[PDB]
Amino acid sequence: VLPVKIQPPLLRPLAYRVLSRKYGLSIKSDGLSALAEFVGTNIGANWRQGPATIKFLEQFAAVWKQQERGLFIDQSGVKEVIQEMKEREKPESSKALDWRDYFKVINASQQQRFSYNPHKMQFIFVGGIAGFLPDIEDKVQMFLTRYYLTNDRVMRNENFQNSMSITPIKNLLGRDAQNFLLLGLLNKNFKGNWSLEDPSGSVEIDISQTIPTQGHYYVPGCMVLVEGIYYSVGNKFHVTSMTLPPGERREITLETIGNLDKDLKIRLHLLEKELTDHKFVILGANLFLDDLKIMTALSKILQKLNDDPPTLLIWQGSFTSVPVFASMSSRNISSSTQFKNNFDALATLLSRFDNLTENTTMIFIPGPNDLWGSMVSLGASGTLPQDPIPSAFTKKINKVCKNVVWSSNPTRIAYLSQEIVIFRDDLSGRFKRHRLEFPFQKVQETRKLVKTILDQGHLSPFLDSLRPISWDLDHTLTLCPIPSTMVLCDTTSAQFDLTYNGCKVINPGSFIHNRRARYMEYVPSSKKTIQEEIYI
């Protein structure tokens, strides 16, 4: 532990003999100098650093898997990883592991570009001011990828559970009256009649004499599994039975992807078991900063939670009563200035509670009444991959606290090996309005909605003509891994919490139901939830 400085020329023979000779590692002058400095700092007389260099090279070969380790980041990375492995074994560090290094939140622009190779692969893809703009091919494939993922789910689940297969639409032409089962995106043609779209082609369907599954919501834009008899005389598929593709468990996707490491998995499991007491507090929907009664209720809730600040405090969409827009007036209506003053008032009313907002991360989710997402949509269902709240309105709010995150509306969290998806949207109203009837209580409706959402494998299985989506940022909405915890914030749906297919779904509902500031609480270690209704 004696600090000292050792020069690169003397360590060069031994360093070479170890890294290059022993395992084939290229060493540069800068990396050699930095490693000599590190060795001198963590050992004196520079004799028994051979184990240290061996640990460095073995970790580098096991994780990095390249050459030329002397780049100041391979060296630093391996050094730090050695630090955490020494820490978990309980040198340079002998402390304990912290969940902050294993807790993170992912925005729509920070996800991993997972494009599924149609034959068999789920590849990874990962430049200027206008560098984020999606390309035309992305608009082409935003539904190609959804089709391919749902097809993988079908050919992994249905055939092994139920084994007559899927016939491509293109291959339905010459067959006269045979029985067929199609996995196709239900839609209405430009002619105004119902049909199914598929990469092989599209087929118009005789929706009459069809019996669907009653535990699902069916809308234009969701992909279904129809079955029936084709007719070449009218070139129409007389469908008799239809259902949504069956869902799959999260571990079923994890074993396919094969993405975790073993030591990382053990550390995450150890932290999950040890961190038994961690509280997540979810606020309701429509936290209107303009409504004075809402600030009264929010002050009461903030005081109550200042007694025991939770681990996380998520803030949901539509922070103001009126949708924002370019407001023309000579007064302070000026919805930008009004929204900034609303955040300033929130900061003033929120800085009053020092125990709160400390040792607690608060995340803000945009909604239908938020800047840069509502200023053009005018309170309508605009772009689904909503960008984070602009920092131009968050000067005072962020200045008050130390851990404030403004995240995407369909954001992802990697707090542990589990993934938590936050999503604020009134999906129930859209589903009820757009549900097509069939010529052939509340908990049942919520079950149908959740089953549709999970079986479709998409956050919004809707046509882009019904809800626009950023073409490149579509994997952010796909439920490919089926992560366990769904923060399905909604305002037109009753508050509930249900589990299915190894996935947990919570709808805290609107912040104010009748007279109470409803908010929600969750314990990940027990994976147990509880409502919190507080009277005004």
Partner 1 sequence: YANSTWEVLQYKDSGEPGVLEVFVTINGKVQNITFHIPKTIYMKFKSQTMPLQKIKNCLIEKSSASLPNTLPESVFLEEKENCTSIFNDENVLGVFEGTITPHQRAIMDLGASVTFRSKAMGALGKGIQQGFEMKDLSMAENERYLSGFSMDIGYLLHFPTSIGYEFFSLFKSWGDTITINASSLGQIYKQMFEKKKGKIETYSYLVDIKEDINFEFVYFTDISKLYRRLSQETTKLKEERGLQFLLLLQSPFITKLLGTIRLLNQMPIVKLSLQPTLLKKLVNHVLSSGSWISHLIKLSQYSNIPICNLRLDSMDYIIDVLYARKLKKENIVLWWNEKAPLPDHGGIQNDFDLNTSWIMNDSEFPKINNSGVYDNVVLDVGVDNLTVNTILTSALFVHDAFSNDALNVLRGMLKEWWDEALKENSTADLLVNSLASWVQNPNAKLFDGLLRYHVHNLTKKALLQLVNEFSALGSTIVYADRNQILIKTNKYSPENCYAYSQYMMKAVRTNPMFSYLDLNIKRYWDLLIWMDKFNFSGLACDYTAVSQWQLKKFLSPIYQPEFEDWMMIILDSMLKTKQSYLKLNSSVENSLNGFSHLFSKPLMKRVKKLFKNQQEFILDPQYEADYVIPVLPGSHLNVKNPLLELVKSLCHVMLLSKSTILEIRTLRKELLKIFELREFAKVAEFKDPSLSLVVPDFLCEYCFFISDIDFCKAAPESIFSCVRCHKAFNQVLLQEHLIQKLRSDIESYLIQDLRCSRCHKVKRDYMSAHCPCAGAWEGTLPRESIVQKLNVFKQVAKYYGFDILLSCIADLT
Q: What is the closest distance, in whole angstroms, from the C-beta atom of residue 286 to partner 1 in the complex?
A: 12
Q: Mask of contacts with partner 1, 136-155, x by CB under 8 A?
A: x--xx--xx--x--------
Which residues make Cβ contacts (< 8 Å) with residue 128, sequence separation at least 6?
none
**Are the C-beta atoms of residues 221 and 462 closer than 8 Å to each other?**
yes
Q: Give the nearer residue to partner 1 in terms of CB position, either 75 or 150.
A: 150
Which residues make Cβ contacts (< 8 Å) with residue 28, sequence separation at least 6?
68, 70, 71
Q: Give the nearer residue to partner 1 in terms of CB position, either 20 or 394.
A: 394
Per rule CB under 8 A, count of chain residues that contact partner 1 = 71
Q: Give the nearer residue to partner 1 in terms of CB position, either 44 or 201.
A: 201
Q: Give the nearer residue to partner 1 in terms of CB position, either 77 or 379.
A: 379
Q: Extract the tokens encoding 216.
A: 């699902």
**Are the C-beta atoms of residues 407 and 370 closer than 8 Å to each other?**
no
Of 175-214, binders to partner 1 (CB under 8 A) are 185, 187, 190, 197-202
Calpha distance 484→478 (Å, rounded): 14
Q: Mask of contacts with partner 1, 258-277, x by CB under 8 A?
A: --------------------
Q: What is the closest distance, in whole angstroms, from the C-beta atom of residue 531 to partner 1 in the complex?
A: 17
Of 66-125, binders to partner 1 (CB under 8 A) are none
Tell me phi and psi for residue 242, to 5 degrees: -150, 145
Q: Give the nearer residue to partner 1 in terms of CB position, either 70 or 317.
A: 317
Q: Give the nearer residue to partner 1 in terms of CB position, either 4 or 140.
A: 140
Which residues make Cβ contacts (< 8 Å) with residue 382, sequence separation at least 6?
368, 373, 374, 376, 468
The neighbour count for residue 474, using CB atoms within 10 Å, is 24
Reference 453, options 533, 405, 407, 507; nearest CA is 507
**Are the C-beta atoms of residues 295 and 266 closer than 8 Å to each other?**
no
Q: Extract the tokens encoding 419.
A: 């993934």
Residue with tokens 């050699």: 32
Q: Give the nearer residue to partner 1 in terms of CB position, either 313 or 375.
A: 375
Q: Give the nearer residue to partner 1 in terms of CB position, either 177 or 333.
A: 333
Q: Applying CB under 8 A, does 343 fall inside the site for partner 1?
A: no
Of 498-517, binders to partner 1 (CB under 8 A) are 514
Q: What is the closest distance, in whole angstroms, from the C-beta atom of residue 163 to partner 1 in the complex?
A: 25
Q: What is the closest distance, in whole angstroms, from the C-beta atom of residue 95 to partner 1 in the complex?
A: 37
Q: Is 515 exposed, middle or buried, given 0-12, 13-18 or 19+ CB atoms closer than 10 A?
A: exposed
Of 280-339, binders to partner 1 (CB under 8 A) are 292, 321-323, 325-337
Binding segment toward partner 1, per CB under 8 A, in 234-242, 247-255, 411-419, 425-433: 425-433
Which residues make Cβ contacts (< 8 Å) with residue 367, sequence separation at least 6?
285, 286, 316, 317, 318, 319, 373, 374, 386, 409, 424
Q: What is the closest distance, in whole angstroms, from the C-beta atom of residue 353 to partner 1 in the complex?
A: 22
Q: Applying CB under 8 A, does 470 fall inside the site for partner 1?
A: yes
Q: How far is CA 227 from CA 237, 240, 474, in A?
A: 9, 6, 29
Q: What is the closest distance, in whole angstroms, from the C-beta atom of residue 416 to partner 1 in the complex?
A: 30
Tell me phi and psi for residue 492, to 5 degrees: -90, 5
Q: What is the closest distance, in whole angstroms, from the C-beta atom of residue 136 to partner 1 in the complex?
A: 5
